[model samples]
Target: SDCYTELEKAVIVLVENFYKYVSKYSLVKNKISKSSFREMLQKELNHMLSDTGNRKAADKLIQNLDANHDGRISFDEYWTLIGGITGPIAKLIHEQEQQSSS
Candidate 1:
């Protein structure tokens, strides 16, 4: 359990620093490995078109999120793949504590 929590924190940090790359790489042109970060990003379209508030479009969105084409999302891609699905939520929650004066 602790490991999971620690992983979550690590993911948050990784994402924060790499948000730009992830934001630009939501579409998957092929499979990806954990080490294939920017390379996987290169496979996606500059921007993935979306229908705001259309939950039905999630499937279509997810289909393209497999940028790494690895079937299973590696932490590198998984951490960054948020197609308006829960990107803001994850980012907000991940950074929630840091926003306050600690």
Candidate 2:
């Protein structure tokens, strides 16, 4: 019963971060509201994520992620967005790292 690998720990941290935002303001339960997502983008991910300062851009990103068009973000939806953003960034980072190594 010892499965604390780096990958498993990383996933646990990611899920914990989600709960850190959930119901922080007592506005929503088990999901993040639109305003909360925007705030999270600004406060938590402003470094890696742009468009948090631009209302239109942020709304557009949210619109795309709102798969069910429910005007809010469920955990699965939020996870998808995180993966969506990070997946491309990972590739870009990998490219730069390889170039630098060469």
Candidate 3:
């Protein structure tokens, strides 16, 4: 349907971006390997995420975000990482909103 609002379209973009990195050879075909995740961070989130170009730093973050320590990133874990990264940006936006409203 061409009935999606801007927000809805944005949500779709988020979901599709995740799939963009999921490797076809992955066992689950729904998760990304450490390498793929690092690549994604480099290509997609270089500006928003720090050390995207630092392999060691990226490895540390993947280790921390690997909730189950499975050496791979599932959708939930990816979303959690995204939320953590987005939190500051969201807070900044809300802070601006409050200041403007006053």
Candidate 4:
């Protein structure tokens, strides 16, 4: 179940641009196809946040992964997204944890 919930964080970020999307109940909505949106998100993420395979991004990501607004990550946050929200973040955490643990 944790794995599935972790996967949802990735999907939520993919759909909402990491909480950047919102609605004011306006007259019209801006709609983009999921593939198009994913493409665009992938581009900016690779460029600005980190390379698609960037492990160093984990440090920055850890700072941003506090989903519950608790001022720090709880076990849920740590297990879920602080480790990673997407493929890249997940891989980074896996690598880093391997070093820290065994």
Highest TM-score model number? 2
Stretch of 10 with least lDDT, candidate 4: 26-35
Q: Local error of candidate 2 at 66, Å?
A: 4.4
Per-model lDDT:
0.46, 0.61, 0.61, 0.43
| Greater-lDDT candidate between 2 and 3 | 3
TM-score of 1: 0.25
Q: What's the best-to-worst order under lDDT?
A: 3, 2, 1, 4
Clashes of 3: 0
Off by over 4 Å in 4: 1-23, 26-29, 47-91, 97-102
- Candidate 3 structure quality by residue, lDDT tens digits, 1-102: 588899999888877777676664563646556557656766776655553334445555666765557655456666665654555455665776688753
Candidate 3 lDDT score at position 61: 62
lDDT of 4 by residue, 1-100 (tens): 3566878877666545532422423212432222232344445456335454454444445445433353321224323542343564556557775887
Full candidate order by TM-score, most accurate first? 2, 3, 4, 1
Q: Is candidate 1 or candidate 4 better by lDDT?
A: 1
Give the higher-TM-score candidate: 1 or 4.
4
Candidate 3's TM-score reads 0.57
Which ten contiguous residues of candidate 1 have the minimum total lDDT? Answer: 45-54
Judge candidate 2 against the unseen true structure and give its global Cα lDDT, from 0 to 1.
0.61
